[PDB]
C-alpha cells in the first residue's frame, strides 16, 4: 500500500 512495516520486521 506503502503499508507500514511492524516494529520488528
Amino acid at each position: 500500500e506503502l503499508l507500514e512495516l511492524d516494529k520488528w520486521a
Partner: antibody, heavy 123, light 108 residues
Framework: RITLKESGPPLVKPTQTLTLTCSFS??????????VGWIRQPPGKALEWLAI???????RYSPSLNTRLTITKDTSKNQVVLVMTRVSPVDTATYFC???????????????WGQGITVTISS | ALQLTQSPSSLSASVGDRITITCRAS??????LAWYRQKPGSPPQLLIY???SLESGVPSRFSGSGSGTEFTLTISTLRPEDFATYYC?????????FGGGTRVDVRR
C-alpha cells in the same frame, strides 16, 4: 505468570467517550519491546485489531479508527489506557487487551490476553 | 489493508478427526502469523506463533506451517475442547490484521 485485566464502563451512551484500562502483572512495560495491544470483538463477529503501544511509547492505531482512539501507558501503575471517542451502537463489543513479547520469533503473536470486557452502547 | 482470508469459514467434525485449516494473506507477511483457538465465553488462546512454532503449554496435536501468503493449522486428532473458533493474525504490517475465523462444530 502474565495476567491482564480490562476495566471501565459496561454501559456507555452514544457520542459519549469510552475509557478502558488494562491492568497487568507478571511483566512491565519497561522490558524493551514489550507491547500491550487492544483487540475488540463485536457479538458474533471476528476479532478486530485496535491499537498497540510498546515500551518506548511507540504507538499504532487502526487507520479506520485513528482519529477516535488515543492509547497511553502509566508505568507506575502498570496500566495501559484506551480512549475511544464518539461511540455509536456499532462499538458494542467485547474489548481485550493483550501482551506482546519483545526481542528475546515469539514477538509474532499476542501471547496472553485479558478475559475482555463487554461494553454496550445504548442511549 | 492486508486482508487475511480464512478457509473454511465454518467446518463440522467429530472427535478423533484430522482437520487442516487455512489463512491466506493478500501480501507476503513472512512468518509473522499467529493462530488462536477461541472457545465461547472465553478469550483467544495462542496455539501457534511465528507461523510454525507451538506455544508452550499447547497440546502437540496442533501444528502450523506456511510462509509468505499461505498458512495452515492442522489438528491431528481433534478433541472435544477443540470445538471452537480459530483465528490467524499477521503482525508483519500495521495494522495487525485478524482473519474472519473458522468455526468448528460437531457433525451429526
Amino acid at each position: 505468570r502474565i495476567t491482564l485485566k480490562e476495566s471501565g464502563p459496561p454501559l456507555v451512551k452514544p457520542t459519549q467517550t469510552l475509557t478502558l484500562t488494562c491492568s497487568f502483572s507478571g511483566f512491565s512495560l519497561s522490558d524493551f519491546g514489550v507491547g500491550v495491544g487492544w483487540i475488540r470483538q463485536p457479538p458474533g463477529k471476528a476479532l478486530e485489531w485496535l491499537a498497540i503501544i510498546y515500551s518506548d511509547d511507540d504507538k499504532r492505531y487502526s487507520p479506520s479508527l485513528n482519529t477516535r482512539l488515543t492509547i497511553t501507558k502509566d508505568t507506575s501503575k502498570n496500566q495501559v489506557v484506551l480512549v475511544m471517542t464518539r461511540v455509536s451502537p456499532v462499538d458494542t463489543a467485547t474489548y481485550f487487551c493483550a501482551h506482546r513479547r519483545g526481542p528475546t520469533g515469539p514477538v509474532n503473536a499476542m501471547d496472553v490476553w485479558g478475559q475482555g470486557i463487554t461494553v454496550t452502547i445504548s442511549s | 489493508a492486508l486482508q487475511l482470508t480464512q478457509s473454511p469459514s465454518s467446518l463440522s467434525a467429530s472427535v478423533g478427526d484430522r482437520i487442516t485449516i487455512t489463512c491466506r494473506a493478500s501480501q507476503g507477511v513472512t512468518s509473522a502469523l499467529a493462530w488462536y483457538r477461541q472457545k465461547p465465553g472465553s478469550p483467544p488462546q495462542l496455539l501457534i506463533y511465528d507461523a510454525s512454532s507451538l506455544e508452550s503449554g499447547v497440546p502437540s496435536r496442533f501444528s502450523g506451517s506456511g510462509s509468505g501468503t499461505e498458512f495452515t493449522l492442522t489438528i491431528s486428532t481433534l478433541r472435544p475442547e477443540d470445538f471452537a473458533t480459530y483465528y490467524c493474525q499477521q503482525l508483519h504490517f500495521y495494522p495487525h490484521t485478524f482473519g474472519g475465523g473458522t468455526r468448528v462444530d460437531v457433525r451429526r
